[PDB]
Every structure is written in C-alpha cells, then in structure tokens.
C-alpha cells in the first residue's frame, strides 16, 4: 500500500542500476524517505502605508 | 450540458453522441432536442 | 535583390503547398526563415503575398508547430484588418479560413475577438 | 599609541568580568552593538591569558563575509604586532595565510568550518570557536549552530562564543537551553531619527525632493547615502537627478552621483573611494551593499525609503521568485547606524511611526527556509544524519521543501534507493560546488557517451559561477564582436574563455570586448581548483585516455557538451509548447517561461528568426516581473533526453 524507507544508522554502489528506479520511482522516494523518519506582487512605488 | 456550454462547438449532433454513448442510454434525436432548448433557458450553475 | 520577384515566389510556395497536402513541410521548412524575417519586416505587397505562403504551410506542419505560428498570424491579421487593400484582403481571408482548423484557437476566442470584425468588413 | 587606543574599546572594561564568565559556562552570548570591539579583542584576550597555551589547539573565529575576514585580520596583525600569516592567520577559501603550528588565532568564514566537519566531525583542533555576526543568519551559519549543538556533549571542554545583535539575541539562548546572555552596549556618535508625518505616493520622487532639501540648505562638508532597491531603480534616479542638476542655477555647488551595487564593474566601484574635493557635495546610491559590507567616509546623511528585494525558492515548482518586500525593523537600524560613522548623522525615513512599529516585522527571514537545500541535505546524509525532521535546527525547512532535495539527490544518482549515500554521492560532498555541477564533471569523465570533454566542462561550470558580472553593459554587444555563430549562451562562455587564454590573460583583451577583467580572474581561480579536486579524485587520468584511445576534435565537441549537461540537470528542461515554453516536470506544470532579454537564444529568436529549438535547457528559472529563463542551451535532439537520463524522461517523452 504505501512504501517506507530507514536509513542505516552507523562496500559502495558504483550505480543506482535501472532495476532499483522501477521498484521506487522517483515521486515516491521524497515522501517515503520522510514517513520513514516519521512525518505522516508590490506595486512600483508606494510607501510603506500608501493606501 | 452547461459546464462545458462556455467553450462549446458547432456540432451538436457529436455531442449529442457522446453523452448518448458514454451514458448507454439511447435518445431519440428530436426527443433530445426539446432538452436543449429546456438547458438553454436556465440562468444559474 | 529585386523585390516583384520575391513577390511572386511567395505566391508560388504557395500554391505547391495547397497542392501538395497534407505531405511535404521537410521540403517546406527550409524556407520558413526567409518569410518571417520579410512579415516583420514590411508592408503592403510583400506582407500580403509572404503571409499568404505562410498560411498555406500552417496546415502541412505538425500540432505544436501549427499552434505556435498560427498565434502569431492572428496577431498580424488582427493589426491588419481595417486594410482597404483587395490583395490584403484576399489573404486574411485565407489565413481564417486555415487557422479556424487549429485546435488552439479556441470558439471562444473567435466569437469575442474575431467574429465581430469580420462580419463587419 | 596602539595599547593606549585598545583600552579605548568598550569591551576592554568589561574584560575582567567576562573571562570568569567564560571559564564557567561553556555557551556565552554576546549581546553588543557594531563598533562594540567584539570581534577584534576578544579572542586577543585569551591568548593574554593562555587559554591555548600549551596545547596544540587554536582558536577560529567565524565572520560570513569573506571581504570582512581578511581585513580584520590585519588589524590584529597592527595591535598584536606580528606579520600576517605567522600568529594571526586567515583562511578563506582562496588564499590560505596560515602557518600549521605558529599561527594561534585564525579568521576563517562560515562557509570552511563546515568543511572542517566533513573530514573531522568532532574539531580535534580547536578550544574557543567564536561565531561572530551570527544575526546575519547566513545558510552556513544556521547548520553550523545546529551541528554544534551536537557536539557539546561529545566534548566538554570546547567553548563556543557567539557575538549577535540587540534584538536576535533572545532567541539563540532558547536554543542551547537558556544558556547564559552578557552584554556589552559600546555606540559611537548616536542619530537623530527623522520620520514623515504622513504616508507618501511614490517615494522615488520624495527621495529626490529630500536630497535637495539637504542640498540647498544644509552644512557643509555632508554626503548623502540613499538606498535603493536594485540596479534599475538606481538608473532611473540617476538620470532624473541629472536633469534637475543641470536646471538649477549656476550658484549652487557641483553634486556628483556615484551609484554602487555588486554587479556594477570595478572601475567605477572605486570612484566612492575617492575623497570629493571642496566646493561640491557627493551623494551616493546604493543597494545593500553599504549597510553591511563597506564602508564609506564622510556619509553624514542617510534617506532611507524602508524597501529591501529578496529571493524566495518556491520548491514545488522550483523556481525563485524575487520580489520587493517591506524591510524588517532590523534591517532599519543597520541602515541608521551608517549615518554615525565620523560624526554625529542624520536619519531620514520615508514613513511614518505608526507604520514603523505596527506594519514593519522584527526578523527579516531566515535564510534556510528562503534558499535551495539540496547541497546541504548531502551535507548532513553524509555526517551520519538519520533523521531530518527531528534534526535540532532553529527555523525548520518546510517539507516541501525538504521532500524535493530528497527526490533531487535520488535523481542524480547520489542516493541508493535503500537511501545509502552511494559512491558518487561521496564525491559530490568533496567538490566546491553544487550537487547538479558536480555530475556534470562526472559524466564527462566516465560515462560511455559523454567521455573526453572535461577540458572544456570545468570551463563552462567557472563561468556559470560568474554570470552575472561578466559583461560590461549588454550582452548582444560583447557577443557579437566575440563571435557570431553561438546558438546557446554556455558555448559562449566556452569561447570567451578560450580566447580569454589564447591571449595569454591579458588585461587589454578584456576592454576590448567589454568584458570584466576582475571577473574574469575570479573565473580562473575556480577552474584551477576544480581541476586541483578532479585529479585527487582521478577524473583527469580517466580523461585523457578517452581523448588519445578516441580521437575526436570535430565539431561533436559541442554535442557531448549538450549530453552532460543533461545529466546533471534533468529535472530543468522546458518543451515548447503553443503559448511559448512550458515546464516538461511531471509535478509541476507548464509555468508558460520566457527567455531573458540577456541571453542569445533572445537574440537569435528576435533579432535573427531562427526557428526555435523544441527543448531547451536553463540554469536558473527565476521570475523578477514575469517567469522567465537564464543561461540557456539548445538541445537538438530529443533522443538525448531519454538516453542521458531514463529515470525521468522514459516517461514523460
């Protein structure tokens, strides 16, 4: 239903790979990176009164 | 009929297919035609 | 460098291009610098005859291209309107007639801006 | 003598009170006005004392203004009487002046001691850091008062010192748990505030009208320092002033106008400098470049219409706006103590004390909600920061704000999708540039498409740093003598550079094609450090063998230059639509955007009639009176968008 991402708290990936973008496309990896740390014209000139 | 009335086209005989089609019910053509002219009189949506 | 031969080879692109729909705006394409280039430019017979060419080439291109040069041919049509010229005329008549089959221009823009004028003229 | 002026200072007769005041708290607040001597004497107090004595830590002192670093550097060069650079140092992020083990006290800014963390997270090196100018509010301060609230419970020992203004003081003692405020209230030569008694139309013309009325009448020597809101309202009451000069009589004495602002060239950014001469009144225009950097002798009045001009990054369609908004009281009395630099000074604003105390607000913004966060989430990802929402920061980004630097980092390939920072993502922390830059080098290293042009990519990107000084007056003029087959304005950088060289850095080129020189040097010093960081990372060697094991110096230089900037900047490509250009994101909709009047894809589409290119790339989608597009590059092809980056573009094409 809905997807959540932890991070892991304290060898490397060369790439993301095309495999991984498919599982989590990128609108979801904004808010699932947040709900898994928890969060569910002026005119040209006047003065500052000027009515 | 009048949420799309501001912008609308010529053909009404489209039109007239189209809410006929995606509705599935069948209108006669001349039966359809006195509620146009019933959706034309009405002042507020 | 003479300007009736310039005249004459817009109403010649022109005519191939009524002929030859819908097919050929790649053939047509190269040409769509030098017309634009004499619409900003000038007046009376040269603007007449380069934007008839123009209007005859709007319904050979493609959607997003159409809609973009059929919007800055209604701004010269519409400064253009009170024109007592028959050769003017001739070709804003032309220019409506394409331009009403571009789904950018929308019936609501030609019942308020349009349509009053021209039935007036 | 020097000893005889330091017991002058306010903050000397304090002193005695405030070193028992240190050694017992570990957070102090300073609460003092400008020209208190906070900054200069403090930390020359502890070297008295021995506070570093035998130890091998030192103390840093943190000013946001690089400008500012130096110069008071020197000053404790003067009273401690030791040359620069051996007891008294100053690292900026150009010329390090330091000794590494005889320098005790250095005055580095804002922006390198968070660099410091990402190397060495707990300050092995220091004792006493001492924020200085902290109601500044920079976004290099803000993280750096969050991060070092971390730290005090990993070590003790460190003392942390913060110098702030009068009316943002109360809100710093809140946030490190109400530790102690002191106060030092040193003001020279106070100001005479005057106000008007009624609201005016258009304060233009009443700025005009209250120069003369110091003009005519007024004692003599006296300058004028007014304050402008930006480049094109300075102009425009330049030229008005110079009629109404001229129209005047014979009897009234010369006034000489002298506009300032940063992107004004240098040649006439000393002409203020200059002491006037008798017989003639100078009356300067500035933007916010006089409050706060400069200083100008012998302004004794200062009108002060009450407008400042900001910049708020909207991040769901991502685009800044800048607009002119109604200046906050704090920014109000930084203006009025411009006035009392020499002497005493007059204080001339245009509104009302009503409008004064109930329309105008205390704090400005804090410029961590206003600015881009997608440098500094990389910043903190990379310090061992899990959770972001619960970070103890002062003014909290808005999610929106905060959700689409999480998104732009995974775009770019920075974070895995598990959310580990992966192995260019370590890379883009070390560069001294944005995360979108530093993939743009990235690519024109390794990748398949794109190799062998990071000659010419680490030209464009010291450019793009540089835009908005380079050219003398327009654009058009500059790039037309230059060359004259650009179509997109990044070739152009490439080209005024590459012949910037073959003229071997020459100062006469540049009045010859209207182009900065002062620029162009800043240009040079950010390419030889981006090349400095590419060879310790390796992209130089990776380079140059896919120049030699492919040859190609053809004209698909300038299209692999296309392909990168692509990769590093996906998410700013527009699609021209019916109306004109419109936005291609999935979020964000056609915003309808229009090319400035600056760039050469201006010129080209109304000057020339080239048929305009159906993608377009741009660096920076700002709106000052209508949206518009800066810094543009024509993609021909529409199959590089889905090749260079199909994690958007598979999509949307």
């Known amino acids: 239903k809905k997807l959540v991402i932890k991070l892991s708290e304290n060898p490397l990936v060369e790439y993301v790979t095309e495999k991984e973008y498919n599982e989590v496309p990128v609108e979801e990896f904004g808010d699932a990176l947040l709900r898994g740390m928890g969060w569910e014209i002026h005119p040209d000139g006047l003065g500052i009164g000027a009515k | 009929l009048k949420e799309n009335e501001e912008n609308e086209d010529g053909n009404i005989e489209e039109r007239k297919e189209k809410i006929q089609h995606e509705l599935g019910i069948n209108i006669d053509s001349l039966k359809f035609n006195e509620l146009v002219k019933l959706m034309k009189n009405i002042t507020d949506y | 460098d003479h300007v009736p031969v310039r005249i004459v080879t817009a109403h010649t692109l022109s005519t191939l291009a009524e002929n030859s729909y819908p097919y050929g705006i790649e053939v047509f394409n190269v040409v769509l610098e030098p017309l634009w280039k004499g619409i900003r430019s000038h007046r009376g017979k040269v603007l007449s005859s380069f934007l008839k060419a123009v209007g005859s080439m709007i319904p050979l291109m493609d959607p997003e291209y159409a809609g973009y040069y059929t919007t800055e041919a209604m701004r010269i049509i519409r400064r253009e309107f009170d024109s007592p010229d028959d050769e003017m005329k001739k070709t804003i008549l032309l220019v409506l007639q394409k331009c009403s089959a571009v789904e950018s221009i929308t019936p609501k823009f030609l019942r308020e801006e349009i349509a009053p004028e021209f039935f007036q003229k | 003598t020097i000893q005889e002026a330091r017991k002058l200072l306010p903050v000397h007769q304090y002193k005695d009170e405030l070193l028992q005041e240190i050694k017992k708290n570990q957070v102090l607040i300073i609460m003092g006005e400008t020209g208190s001597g906070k900054t200069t004497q403090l930390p020359q107090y502890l070297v008295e004392d021995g506070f570093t004595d035998q130890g091998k830590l030192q103390i840093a002192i943190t000013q946001p203004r690089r400008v500012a670093a130096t110069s008071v550097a020197a000053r404790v060069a003067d009273e401690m009487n030791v040359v620069l650079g051996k007891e008294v140092g100053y690292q900026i992020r150009f010329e390090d002046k330091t000794t590494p083990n005889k320098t005790v006290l250095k005055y580095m800014t804002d922006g390198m001691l968070l660099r410091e963390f990402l190397t060495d997270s707990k300050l092995s090196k220091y004792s006493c850091i001492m924020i200085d100018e902290a109601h500044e509010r920079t976004l290099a301060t803000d993280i750096l008062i969050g991060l070092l609230k971390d730290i005090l419970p990993q070590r003790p020992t460190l003392k942390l010192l913060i110098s702030s203004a009068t009316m943002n003081a109360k809100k710093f003692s809140e946030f490190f748990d109400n530790c102690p405020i002191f106060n030092v209230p040193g003001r020279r030569y106070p100001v005479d505030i005057h106000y008007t008694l009624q609201p005016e139309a258009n304060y233009i013309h009443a700025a005009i009208t209250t120069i003369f009325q110091i003009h005519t009448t007024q004692s003599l020597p006296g300058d004028i320092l007014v304050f402008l809101t930006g480049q094109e309202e300075i102009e425009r009451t330049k030229t008005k002033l110079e009629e109404i000069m001229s129209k005047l009589g014979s009897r009234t004495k010369q006034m000489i106008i002298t506009p300032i602002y940063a992107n004004l060239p240098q040649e006439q950014q000393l002409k203020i400098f200059q002491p006037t001469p008798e017989n003639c009144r100078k009356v300067v225009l500035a933007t916010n470049i006089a409050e706060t950097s400069l200083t100008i002798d012998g302004i004794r009045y200062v009108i002060d219409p009450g407008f400042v001009k900001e910049?708020?990054?909207?991040?769901?369609?991502?685009?800044?706006?800048?607009?002119?908004?109604?200046?906050?009281?704090?920014?109000?009395?930084?203006?009025?103590?411009?006035?009392?630099?020499?002497?005493?000074?007059?204080?001339?604003?245009?509104?009302?004390?009503?409008?004064?105390?109930?329309?105008?607000?205390?704090?400005?913004?804090?410029?961590?909600?206003?600015?881009?966060?997608?440098?500094?989430?990389?910043?903190?990802?990379?310090?061992?920061?899990?959770?972001?929402?619960?970070?103890?920061?002062?003014?909290?980004?808005?999610?929106?704000?905060?959700?689409?630097?999480?998104?732009?980092?995974?775009?770019?390939?920075?974070?895995?999708?598990?959310?580990?920072?992966?192995?260019?993502?370590?890379?883009?922390?070390?560069?001294?540039?944005?995360?979108?830059?530093?993939?743009?080098?990235?690519?024109?290293?390794?990748?398949?498409?794109?190799?062998?042009?990071?000659?010419?990519?680490?030209?464009?990107?010291?450019?793009?740093?540089?835009?908005?000084?380079?050219?003398?007056?327009?654009?058009?003029?500059?790039?037309?003598?230059?060359?004259?087959?650009?179509?997109?304005?990044?070739?152009?950088?490439?080209?005024?550079?590459?012949?910037?060289?073959?003229?071997k850095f020459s100062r006469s080129w540049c009045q010859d094609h209207k182009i900065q020189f002062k620029t162009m040097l800043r240009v040079?010093?950010?390419?030889?450090?981006?090349?400095?960081?590419?060879?310790?990372?390796?992209?130089?060697?990776?380079?140059?063998?896919?120049?030699?094991?492919?040859?190609?110096?053809?004209?698909?230089?300038?299209?692999?230059?296309?392909?990168?900037?692509?990769?590093?900047?996906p998410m700013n490509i527009v699609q021209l639509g019916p109306t004109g250009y419109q936005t291609m994101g999935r979020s964000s909709g056609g915003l309808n955007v229009s090319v400035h009047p600056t760039s050469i894809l201006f010129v080209n589409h109304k000057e020339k009639a080239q048929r305009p290119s159906k993608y377009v790339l741009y660096q920076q989608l700002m709106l000052t009176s209508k949206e518009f597009i800066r810094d543009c590059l024509v993609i021909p092809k529409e199959e590089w968008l889905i090749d260079m980056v199909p994690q958007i573009f598979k999509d949307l094409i």
């Not at chain 4, 960081?533 to 140059?544: A, H, I, M, R, T």
């Not at chain 4, 896919?546 to 698909?556: E, F, L, T, V, W």
């Open chain 4, 311 to 503: 910049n708020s990054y909207v991040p769901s369609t991502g685009m800044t706006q800048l607009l002119t908004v109604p200046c906050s009281r704090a920014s109000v009395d930084q203006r009025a103590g411009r006035a009392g630099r020499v002497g005493p000074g007059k204080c001339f604003r245009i509104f009302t004390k009503w409008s004064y105390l109930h329309e105008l607000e205390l704090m400005p913004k804090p410029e961590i909600t206003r600015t881009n966060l997608s440098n500094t989430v990389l910043l903190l990802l990379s310090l061992g920061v899990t959770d972001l929402i619960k970070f103890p920061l002062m003014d909290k980004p808005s999610i929106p704000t905060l959700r689409k630097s999480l998104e732009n980092l995974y775009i770019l390939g920075a974070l895995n999708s598990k959310g580990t920072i992966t192995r260019l993502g370590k890379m883009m922390c070390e560069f001294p540039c944005e995360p979108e830059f530093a993939k743009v080098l990235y690519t024109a290293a390794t990748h398949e498409q794109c190799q062998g042009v990071l000659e010419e990519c680490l030209t464009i990107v010291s450019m793009l740093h540089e835009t908005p000084s380079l050219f003398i007056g327009q654009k058009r003029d500059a790039a037309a003598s230059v060359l004259s087959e650009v179509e997109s304005d990044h070739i152009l950088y490439l080209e005024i550079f590459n012949q910037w060289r073959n003229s």
């Open chain 4, 524 to 569: 040079r010093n950010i390419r030889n450090q981006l090349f400095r960081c590419s060879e310790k990372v390796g992209l130089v060697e990776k380079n140059d063998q896919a120049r030699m094991k492919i040859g190609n110096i053809a004209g698909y230089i300038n299209a692999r230059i296309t392909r990168c900037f692509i990769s590093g900047f």
